Each structure stands twice: as structure tokens, then as C-alpha cells.
Amino acid sequence: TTIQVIGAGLPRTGTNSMKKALEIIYSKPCYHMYEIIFKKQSDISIWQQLIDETHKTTSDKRKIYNGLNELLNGYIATTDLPSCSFYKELMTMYPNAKVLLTIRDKYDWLYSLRKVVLPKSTDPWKLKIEEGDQVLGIDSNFYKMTEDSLKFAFQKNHINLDDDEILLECYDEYNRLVQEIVPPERLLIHHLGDGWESLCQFLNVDIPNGISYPCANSHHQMTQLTEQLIKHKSLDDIIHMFPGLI
Ligand SMILES: Nc1ncnc2c1ncn2[C@@H]1O[C@H](COP(=O)(O)O)[C@@H](OP(=O)(O)O)[C@H]1O
Ligand SMILES: CC(C)NC[C@@H]1CCc2cc(CO)c([N+](=O)[O-])cc2N1
């Protein structure tokens, strides 16, 4: 059991739905940020060490490959931040794995990103996210790892993450680059809304009979989850309000 599909799509492009879709297709687990937050928060420091390794004048690529392989043990696929930023290293490690690029309108993406993953530093919603994350046992190291992995995906050392215009152009550049460096036969570009057909064709499987394509992880749902975590101060107490999400 090793990686068959590498999800290179950025966060907030339908990765949790793609995660669920792949788990339906393969009946084996797919990695996602939800795996880290809700199941394995100890992975945060490991991802941080790997991203830190990339910032060295001479990076130890074998250390990174071995670290990626350990993180992804028991998974059939990976999606989302932070793994998407390592899609090149994953491609090298798993030469037979196919690559998915989940994609969507860039303006909707940015809006989604600011609501969940990367608020502007002066946005009051950032404090509500933090307070909510406190309930989940998430600390400040989490934000450093996600920030560093976005910067790593965009291949930038210095960047003003509060500038929407920069993030929009980074998004387009990122998706262009994936399309440039992944051979066409090894890549499926999956637009938000595309559903089973193109995906199943690509992965050489039939469309799941009587099972609809997943639709999960809206910023509306994430805003409500943040609100409810703050109100009740317990995930277990509110999880029934979020069926089928985690
Ligand atoms: N089947 C589907 N059709 C349309 N949008 C979908 C979808 N599945 C997920 N999404 C959207 O993809 C985004 C989440 O992606 P990710 O899981 O990578 O964080 C959300 O966007 P919004 O925040 O605009 O609602 C979510 O609503
Ligand atoms: C709602 C509040 C309690 N925070 C929890 C949410 C869960 C989904 C999520 C997903 C990503 C990337 O998919 C990131 N990210 O990269 O920062 C952060 C979060 N945070």
C-alpha cells in the first residue's frame, strides 16, 4: 500500500471532497489537512522540519523523501496543504502515481482562502480562528507550518501574504507550473463541479454506482464550526452539527 494519486491542488480548491472521492474509489485512506488537525497533530512538527530542510543551501533530498514516505505510510493518496507543495518530490518518489490538479475560479479561491486558511494579519476574524483552534488543541506552530508550506508552494522566501493581488498571481502561476511540468498523460485537471466522470476515466475505474460526488468543507461550514467551537468549547459536544465532515 503506497501512493497512487498525488493531489497537487492548492487548499480551498475542493481537496477535502477529492480526499473523500479517492477514499470511495480505493477504500483506503487519503491524506489531507484534516488528517493532521483532527487525527495526527504530531505531524505538524515533521512537516515543519521538511519545509525547513528545503530552505538550506544544500537540502538533503533523501531526508525529505524518507520523511514524506513515513508521513504517508498507509495512505493511497494525498491532497491539500502541506503535501501539495511537495508534489514534485512525490512524483519523483512514486513514478507511477498519477497527479491531480484541483482548480477553481481564482477570485472564489482567494475569498475562501482568506476565510479559513490565511486571513490578512489585521483581519479580526484571525482571532476567532485562533480561539476556535485553541479548542482543538492547535497552537501557533500550526500557522507557521501552513504559512511556510504556502510560501514553499509559491517558491517565495519573502512575500506579503496580506496582498490579494500577489496571492492571485501566485495562484495562477502555481497552477500554470503544475501543468507545465507534469506530463499531460499523467495529469488530470479537475474543475470544481466536474464530478466522477473525468476522474474515474483517469484512474481507470467505473463511476461509483448510486454514490454522488462529495461536496464538503465550505467556508460557511468552517465559519459555523469556528463559532460553535468558541461557544461550546468542545469538538465532541458539537461534532453532531457537522455530519460526514471530519
Ligand atoms: N462538489 C463540489 N462542488 C462545488 N464546490 C465544492 C465541491 N466540493 C468542495 N467544494 C468547495 O471547495 C472548497 C473547499 O476546498 P478544500 O477542501 O480544498 O478546502 C469550498 O469552497 P468555498 O469555501 O468557496 O465554499 C467548497 O465549498
Ligand atoms: C475552523 C477552525 C477551527 N480551523 C479549522 C480549519 C480546518 C480546515 C483547515 C484546512 C486548511 C487547509 O486545508 C487549513 N490551513 O492550511 O490553515 C486550516 C484549516 N483550519
Automatic annotation (TrEMBL):
<feature type="binding site">
    <location>
        <position position="54"/>
    </location>
    <ligand>
        <name>Ca(2+) 1</name>
    </ligand>
</feature>
<feature type="binding site">
    <location>
        <position position="165"/>
    </location>
    <ligand>
        <name>Ca(2+) 3</name>
    </ligand>
</feature>
<feature type="binding site">
    <location>
        <position position="194"/>
    </location>
    <ligand>
        <name>Ca(2+) 2</name>
    </ligand>
</feature>
<feature type="binding site">
    <location>
        <position position="137"/>
    </location>
    <ligand>
        <name>Ca(2+) 2</name>
    </ligand>
</feature>
<dbReference type="InterPro" id="IPR027417">
    <property type="entry name" value="P-loop_NTPase"/>
</dbReference>
<keyword id="KW-0106">Calcium</keyword>
<feature type="binding site">
    <location>
        <position position="169"/>
    </location>
    <ligand>
        <name>Ca(2+) 3</name>
    </ligand>
</feature>
<dbReference type="GO" id="GO:0046872">
    <property type="term" value="F:metal ion binding"/>
</dbReference>
<feature type="binding site">
    <location>
        <position position="56"/>
    </location>
    <ligand>
        <name>Ca(2+) 1</name>
    </ligand>
</feature>
<keyword id="KW-0479">Metal-binding</keyword>
<dbReference type="InterPro" id="IPR040632">
    <property type="entry name" value="Sulfotransfer_4"/>
</dbReference>
<feature type="binding site">
    <location>
        <position position="139"/>
    </location>
    <ligand>
        <name>Ca(2+) 2</name>
    </ligand>
</feature>
<feature type="binding site">
    <location>
        <position position="59"/>
    </location>
    <ligand>
        <name>Ca(2+) 1</name>
    </ligand>
</feature>
<protein>
    <recommendedName>
        <fullName>Nad dependent epimerase/dehydratase</fullName>
    </recommendedName>
</protein>
<dbReference type="Pfam" id="PF17784">
    <property type="entry name" value="Sulfotransfer_4"/>
</dbReference>
